[PDB]
Design a protein around this nucleic acid. Sequence first.
RNA 1: UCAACCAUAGACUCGGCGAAAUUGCACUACGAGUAAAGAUGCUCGUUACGCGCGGCAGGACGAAAAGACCCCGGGACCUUCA
RNA 2: AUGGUUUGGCACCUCGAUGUCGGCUCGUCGCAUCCUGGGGCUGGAGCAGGUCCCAAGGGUUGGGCUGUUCGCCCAUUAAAGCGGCACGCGAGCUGGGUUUAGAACGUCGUGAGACAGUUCGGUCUCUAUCCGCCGCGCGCGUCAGAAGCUUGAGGAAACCUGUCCCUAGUACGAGAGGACCGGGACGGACGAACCUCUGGUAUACCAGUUGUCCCACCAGGGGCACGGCUGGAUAGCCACGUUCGGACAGGAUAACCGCUGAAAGCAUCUAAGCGGGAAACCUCUUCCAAGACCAGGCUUCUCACCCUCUAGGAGGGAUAAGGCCCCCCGCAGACCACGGGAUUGAUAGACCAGACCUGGAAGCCUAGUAAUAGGUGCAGGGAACUGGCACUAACCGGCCGAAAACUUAC
Lengths: 113, 118, 54, 122, 23, 37, 214
Amino acid sequence: MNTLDFVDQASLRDDIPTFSPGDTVNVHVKVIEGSKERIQVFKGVVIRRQGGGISETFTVRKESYGVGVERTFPVHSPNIDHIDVLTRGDVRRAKLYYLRELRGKKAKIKEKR
Amino acid sequence: PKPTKGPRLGGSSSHQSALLANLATSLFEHGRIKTTEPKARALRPYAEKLITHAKKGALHNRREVMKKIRDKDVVHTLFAEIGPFYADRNGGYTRIIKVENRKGDNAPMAVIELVREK
Amino acid sequence: AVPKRRMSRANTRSRRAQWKAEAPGLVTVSVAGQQRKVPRRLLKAARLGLVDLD
Amino acid sequence: MIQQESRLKVADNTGAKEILCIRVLGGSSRRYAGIGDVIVATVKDAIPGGNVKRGDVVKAVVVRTVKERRRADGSYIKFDENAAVIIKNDNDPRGTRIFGPVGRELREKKFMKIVSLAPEVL
Amino acid sequence: AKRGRKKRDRKHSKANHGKRPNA
Amino acid sequence: MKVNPSVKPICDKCRVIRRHGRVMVICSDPRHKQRQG
Amino acid sequence: ARKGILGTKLGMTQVFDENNKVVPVTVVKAGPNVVTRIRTTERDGYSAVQLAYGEISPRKVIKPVAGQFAAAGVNPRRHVAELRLDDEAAVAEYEVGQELTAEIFSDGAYVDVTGTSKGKGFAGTMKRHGFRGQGAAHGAQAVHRRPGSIGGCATPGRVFKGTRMSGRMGNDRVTTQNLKVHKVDAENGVLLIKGAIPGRNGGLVVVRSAIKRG
RNA sequence: UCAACCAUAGACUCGGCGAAAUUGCACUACGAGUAAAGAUGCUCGUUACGCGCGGCAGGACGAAAAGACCCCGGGACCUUCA
RNA sequence: AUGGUUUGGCACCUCGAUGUCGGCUCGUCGCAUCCUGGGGCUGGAGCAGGUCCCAAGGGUUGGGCUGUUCGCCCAUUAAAGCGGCACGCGAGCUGGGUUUAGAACGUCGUGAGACAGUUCGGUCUCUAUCCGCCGCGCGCGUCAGAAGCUUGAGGAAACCUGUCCCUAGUACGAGAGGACCGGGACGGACGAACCUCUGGUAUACCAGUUGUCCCACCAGGGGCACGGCUGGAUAGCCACGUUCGGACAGGAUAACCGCUGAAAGCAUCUAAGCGGGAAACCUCUUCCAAGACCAGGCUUCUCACCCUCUAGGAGGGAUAAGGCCCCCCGCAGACCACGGGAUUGAUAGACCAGACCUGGAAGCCUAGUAAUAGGUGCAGGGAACUGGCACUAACCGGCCGAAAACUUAC
């Protein structure tokens, strides 16, 4: 419980799928380019799911054209059309910052079977 | 628990942990102990949480106690005739009683004791 | 640093008076029948018997 | 978060491999260059055969920052290298290609040619 | 300078009678 | 305007006056405008 | 006009606007305030409204305060405070016993929030006045955070009043100006105000209309 | 850049013991002046309820060391075709 | 002629000690204004300038070389001001230089040794008494004692500015080029508050893990090694973060533009009068503030007893309203103060639940020779955040604390 839960529950988004760090996802983020709303897919590994409630952020990492990229979205942001989980990851940590120094097969999360 | 805001009791976090362990050991061994007011104030949550572990009688709780106590006789006492004694009690296992100050340092003193009213 | 001059008696005493003691406020307690005076801080422990009343 | 004596990679094919910032433009005693912020730099490393050579003073635009930059939507964007594009005075690149992704802030800071040339604009 | 000027012009007073020490 | 301690006429049209405690010189030719200062 | 109200700060949070842009807000429990006295020029020399806020037991009230609230004709509250106005035409709206809620404001209004800053205790000149300290190396003998010079020399021979020195920071009245209310919530009786508010959570504040921006 | 945080020893508070350099005095303000030419102490004004605690170090030309630089006087040691 | 910042002259305080250059920190002042602001003249078409006047509110970058100040240079900038304050500031720092003792080069000197010549190296002491300054309390006073809310004399703070767009490629101009005025957006720097985000930190959080010792042993754990190290990390503190701010408007003015107008039949911004006019000034914004000794104001509460002196003026006691101390506490805090609470109670702790952090406990089972893995099981552990619960502790309580009247008017 918190003291502002009654304020946050309004903006609290349903349809947020249950995911966790290590889980690979596709975030369909709304992108505006000069009076033109489209959707960009940030496909990447969740390294982090900080926070609670409306303030909850999740950080998704990918390697685009030979460069690491991380997007820290709010979980209940309405700029996110949806989040499509693809693979769940077997990780022994809650925050996969060690991927920031790993490029390639070293940065391949163990899929959950 | 709510950690020590200020400087720790024994000039070190280590010596604070050791103090609290030894003082809880003594408190469960003897029922009451006289020490300084701050040491008692800090011990009361420590000891009450160990007693909570003792009320929740199970091996996990016994080991979570033994990682602080290290006196097996006191651990047994906790899990045999303290925890059960306080099964009906929802907290409030200890009371602090302010007493006369020392002479050599005028240190405020307090007797921290276990309650025995039920 | 050091004091430039001998402080006068007036000023010396003016602050030396501030080095005093606040006397403790006492209350009555009826342990062992007799009415003794203790601090309210120690009232409980005196009712119990943890207060050396000389 | 880029400042004087900060070394950046070059996300283009001018011949420069890395540069060193001198000034962040935007005002007086400007400290930090985020994405879309123009800088004055010098080429510290360059490929052997290149248009711009070692020691050439140039303008550049920052397109990747390690330090996460907020966005109005509450999101953030963070890369693993600080990288920039060398430009002319028309805010157009001196090179003809752009390596790696760039931030979307370039679109609002009017570096549309770089936005177009880049493979991914995030 | 101002200080010397003022101190000298002080001598132009009914009491000093146009003379003062160090003028 | 010229601001100098020596303000004086420059031509026959330049007239001298005392305005607001200041000696001014006025003229059709505004080049010849002057003020004491 | 400069309509206002007393409330309590509850904490900060996020919301999202129509553009999906994030708004850091502070939730202010702009609560049921009750008018307890009207200040007039014919009586007090100035135009103002005395408001009262905060539930309180009628036994924790000091009896003078009880008598004040009684002669007003209301039940006591914890905090009392005046809102200065500009004229009798502005004070004529407030009647004693009148109840003020968050609904006096409206979404998009600009407010000034007066609160009591958090206490930073006895602070050094760095934390208190943004002094650069001195070097942490290169010979510095024990001046790594010390203010350095304090005045001139003999010619001044003194330290000027108002010099910036170490001391207690915080617990000072702070008016943050031109905060845009993101939302009113009369059901809960609160205001979502874009951005920081002075004080701790649970701290009393005064949300007034912005004296600059309407 | 540009500093933030944590602990510890001090500093702070309580108890106990208990110094020091210094000291012409004293109920030791500020300005502009004046003055052995840089004033707490004088003049004209301004300001200031009395007493403490923690702090800072601009002044008390602060303490310390009868300035080592300079000069005068005297020594000492050194040099040399004195 | 100013000024007194340069080199100097004098040698007036200081040689029973006034520490020196430069830098760092902290500033403060002047304006002889670098920018911003206002304006006159122009050989001012416009952009941009030049020159002069008013203006000191704010701002006036970071680097390379050098001990350096200065200067040159690099990039920038709206601008990269000039000076004073013991060439501000060493009981605030440095100590690279100068300016001890060592050594060396060059030169001088027979030599010892010397050099506003160079070179390498080379102890920066002091517990703050007074003033002052920053903050915080105690006492008394403000004609009874108290309480709440306040006024605002008087002070403090803040005061910066660019780029782009439209106006308009219009005015102007052969063109090149290119506006004033006025609107709009986005910014830099500075500052305040805040911690929802991000990010840092986390010495009683979680996990892993090395070495070693111990809990008899396995298992599980603990002590120590910078919290042993690592990986993460809620609160709080905080900035790199968030938000906000500088205003608008008015008055009076400077330079300046003027009107009506004489003296002086004209003319004249002035002598009587009337106006306009700047980031300066006063107002405005924020903050402190009635010790504002004219010690304020609006209200509310108590608004009542005894004793002794010989009842004169007092003194002592007990009280009320109320407050203090003790007590539980705080995101309040050096102490003190402040704030809250105090059994007619959720103030703290415990407990319960949640949130959050960690990330899947122990035990048992299963698979595997084993290392280990999987299930039981968003497990277990756990601090600050929230909410519930009087279980513990806020006590069977002590100390302070209230009225001479008089005069006049109504």
